[PDB]
Amino acid sequence: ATFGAWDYGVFATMLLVSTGIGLWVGLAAAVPVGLSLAASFMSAVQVLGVPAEAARYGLKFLWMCAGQLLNSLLTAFLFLPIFYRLGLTSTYQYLELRFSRAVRLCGTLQYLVATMLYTGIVIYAPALILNQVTGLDIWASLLSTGIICTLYTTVGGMKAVVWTDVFQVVVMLVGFWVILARGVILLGGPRNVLSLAQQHSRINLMDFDPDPRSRYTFWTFIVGGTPFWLSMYGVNQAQVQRYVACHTEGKAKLALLVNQLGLFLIVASAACCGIVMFVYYKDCDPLLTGRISAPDQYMPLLVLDIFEDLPGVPGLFLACAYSGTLSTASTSINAMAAVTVEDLIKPRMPGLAPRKLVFISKGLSFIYGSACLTVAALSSLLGGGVLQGSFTVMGVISGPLLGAFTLGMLLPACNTPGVLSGLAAGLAVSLWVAVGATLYPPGEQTMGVLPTSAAGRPALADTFYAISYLYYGALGTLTTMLCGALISYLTGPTKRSSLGPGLLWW
Ligand code: NA
Ligand code: NA
Numbered sequence: 001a002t003f004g005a006w007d008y009g010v011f012a013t014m015l016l017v018s019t020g021i022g023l024w025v026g027l028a029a030a031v032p033v034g035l036s037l038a039a040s041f042m043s044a045v046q047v048l049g050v051p052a053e054a055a056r057y058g059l060k061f062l063w064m065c066a067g068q069l070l071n072s073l074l075t076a077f078l079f080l081p082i083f084y085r086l087g088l089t090s091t092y093q094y095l096e097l098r099f100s101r102a103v104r105l106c107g108t109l110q111y112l113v114a115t116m117l118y119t120g121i122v123i124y125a126p127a128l129i130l131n132q133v134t135g136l137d138i139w140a141s142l143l144s145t146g147i148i149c150t151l152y153t154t155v156g157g158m159k160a161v162v163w164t165d166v167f168q169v170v171v172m173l174v175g176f177w178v179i180l181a182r183g184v185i186l187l188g189g190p191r192n193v194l195s196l197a198q199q200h201s202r203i204n205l206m207d208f209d210p211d212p213r214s215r216y217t218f219w220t221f222i223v224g225g226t227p228f229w230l231s232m233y234g235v236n237q238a239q240v241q242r243y244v245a246c247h248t249e250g251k252a253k254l255a256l257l258v259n260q261l262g263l264f265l266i267v268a269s270a271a272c273c274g275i276v277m278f279v280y281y282k283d284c285d286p287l288l289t290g291r292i293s294a295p296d297q298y299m300p301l302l303v304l305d306i307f308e309d310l311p312g313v314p315g316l317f318l319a320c321a322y323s324g325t326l327s328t329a330s331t332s333i334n335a336m337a338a339v340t341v342e343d344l345i346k347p348r349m350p351g352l353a354p355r356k357l358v359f360i361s362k363g364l365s366f367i368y369g370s371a372c373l374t375v376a377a378l379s380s381l382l383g384g385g386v387l388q389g390s391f392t393v394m395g396v397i398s399g400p401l402l403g404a405f406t407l408g409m410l411l412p413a414c415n416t417p418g419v420l421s422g423l424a425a426g427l428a429v430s431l432w433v434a435v436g437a438t439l440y441p442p443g444e445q446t447m448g449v450l451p452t453s454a455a456g457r458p459a460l461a462d463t464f465y466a467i468s469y470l471y472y473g474a475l476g477t478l479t480t481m482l483c484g485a486l487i488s489y490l491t492g493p494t495k496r497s498s499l500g501p502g503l504l505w506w
Contacts, residue, residue, distance in 0.1 A: 001304050003133050003314065010315030011322075018323035019148065022164075023156040030251055032162045034258025037239060039165035041232060042172060042266050043325035044125040049387025050267060051302075052295040054274025055281075056449050057216050058204035059197075061271050065264045066218070067225030072260040074226070075234035075243075076253045082409060082502060083240050084249045090343050091240045091405075097502050098408040100416040106423055107401050108343050111237060112336055114397035116368060119332045120375020121390045123149055125296075126322045127376060128386065132292075132300050133318055138380050145326070146373040153330040154366045160331045168324040169262060175317050176269035182306050183276035196279045201450060203275075212467040215447040224470030227477045228391060231398035233259070235405050238335040277302045283456035296385055333372065337364035388469050395473020396434045400426030402473075403480025409504045411485055412496040418488025426480030434472050436465035 003011070054061045083091060092111070096104040127145040131138045152158065187193050197203055209217045233239050233256075243252040277298060286292045292301055300314070307313040341361050346352070379389060400423045407414040407422065440461035447468075467475075488494070496503070 001301075001308070002135050003304075003318075004311050006311035007313075007315035007318075008134075010312035011319045012315075014316060014319035015148075015323060018319065019151070022152055022159040022323070022327065025159040025161060025164075026157040030246075030254035031258050032166055033242060033246060034255040035169050035262055036162040036165035037233075037242060037255060037259040038262030038266065039169045039172075039324075040239070040328060040331065041263075042169070043122050043328045044129055044321040045122055045325075045386045045390050046266065046270060047172070047321050048125055048128065048296045048299055049385055050270035051274030051277050052298045052385070053216070053387065054271040055202070055278035055298060056295060058202040058207075058450055059271065059275060060204045060207040060216050060218075061274070062205060062268065063207075063216075063218050063221035064225055065267050067221045068229050068263050068267075069260060070222060070226045071229030071233060072256050074230060076256050078409070078504065079230075079234040079240070079405070080243055080252055080256070081249065082504065084244050084252060086502060087244065090339065091235060091237045092343065094502060095404065095408065095419075097500060099404075099414070099419050103404065103416060103419055103423075105344070106420065107404060108339065110397055110401045110423075112340065114231075114394050114401075115238075115332055115336050116371050117375050117393040117397070118390055119329050119336075119368075119372040121379050121386055121393060122325060122332070123329050123372055124376035124379045125386045126325045127380070128296055129300055129318055129321055132297050133304065133314060139377075142373070142377055142380065145322075145376075146369075148322075149326045149329055149373070150366070150369050152326050153333050153369050154362060158327075158330045158334045160327065160334075164327065168320075168327065169266070171320045172324065173265060173269055175320060176266075176273050178313075179273050179303065179306070179317075180269070180276055183273075183280055183302070186306060187276070187279055193276060193279050196282060197275050200278070200282070202278055209448075212471055213442060213446050215442075215449075215468045215470075217468075220468045220470045224468060224474045227399055227402055227474040228395050228470070231394060231402045231473065235398075235402055237339060238332070273299070280306070281452075283453055285452040285454050288452050288454035294383070294385070329369075329372065333365055333368045336368045337361050340364050392434055392469050392472050395470075396430035396476060397427070399430055399473035399476030400424075400480040403477040403484065406477070407481055407484045407488075408502070411488070412499055412503055412505075413493035414484055414488040415491060415494045417491040418484040418486070421487040422480040422482070422484025425483035426476035426478075429479045430472050430476030433465060433467065433475060436461065437467075437469070437472075440465050442466040 050061065086094070088094060088097065092104050092107045095107045123145060127138060127142040130136060130141040130145065184190055184193055207217050208219065210219070212220065214220065246252045246255060280302060286301055287295065292298060303314045303317050338361065341357060341364060345360060403426055404419050404423050407419055440457050446466055
């Protein structure tokens, strides 16, 4: 079952309309800002991953929202007050005010590399969907996705408005709910779906398994996901700039609350879609049967399976997962180019020119876009899910950056030697665990996948590399904090009297 004729027509019409809208807004109050904040992480990555994870691991996936809530509370009262009352353009200027320009450069480069890899996986996800629905080879699908993404970004100009992001979130939620409704009406009713999921053990919210090898758990979500969401929202420049651009500090807090509500809505809808998807494929699992090869192919298969008599709805869902992910990728790439120009190029060439800078920014946008496309191709060639891949790519690189920020805001004795040594230690540890886990992946029974049906190595691998992927970034943050403090107190602790008003204790 591939795209029908009307499915192609609907996808083409909506994609052309969205591309034209994005290339026309261009060439020719706390609610919207929070909704645009929410429609900056959510893309086709979540649409592909969260339902698959909820089907394979159960309803315990909802603790991702608890991790998001902890991050949102931390940002609202810990990072936002400083980043707002201080008014210092880029968040990495704080690392200059606190430690040194070396730390500022290190943090900026960390952000750039993490964003480039994350945007690569984000770009890969729509190519995966277009591969699976239209049968086009993954390489030609990636070529098409890159062409449309670079027309969005560079040759047409990014159009990111808070209002197009709101429309994206609305259509995402409505699509999840429509899939849910069709699935449940096909499967009898909500009571029967709940009974079949309770019998088959996909209702497993209260999971407090102490083992870090278990992929998903209350602990893995609160102490592994919170650093990820802090690196995504509380410290990330592209979000904190929106926080500071809001007039009055309370307005940013309200925007954060609206962002948290939107995130919870999206995650809950996707997890319900995942449980309904499992119950639909109860005795004829397509992965076991071999109809699909990876869990990332679960959701478009369900979309094309349950909308067979409604020609063109899979086309609409593909169009919305394509335009809405390419918008996020374009926004990330242009944010990367602006960060490079206004943090690393403009300071060191004072009188370069003002017309030189538009050319340089366009070049950086193209360069980052091509680099992210290469990341997408390598993500294809290495396999693996898009959700966990994005989580790992962001965590392993941005955990030490979060540790540096936390050491600056919390510990007055931290200095440039300590913070830089701790950043190095964090990157080393995160890369070690990530690469060792890639070489030796944990088994599915160890990870805790739930059973399906189709009727109808080094001794450090089994312990250290087998921990959950949500811990790769948190591990880096913790080793950054520990090494930074230990080296700061050895190399000469900064005196509080010799610190500007950037400490959290005021
Ligand atoms: Na998005
Ligand atoms: Na995403």
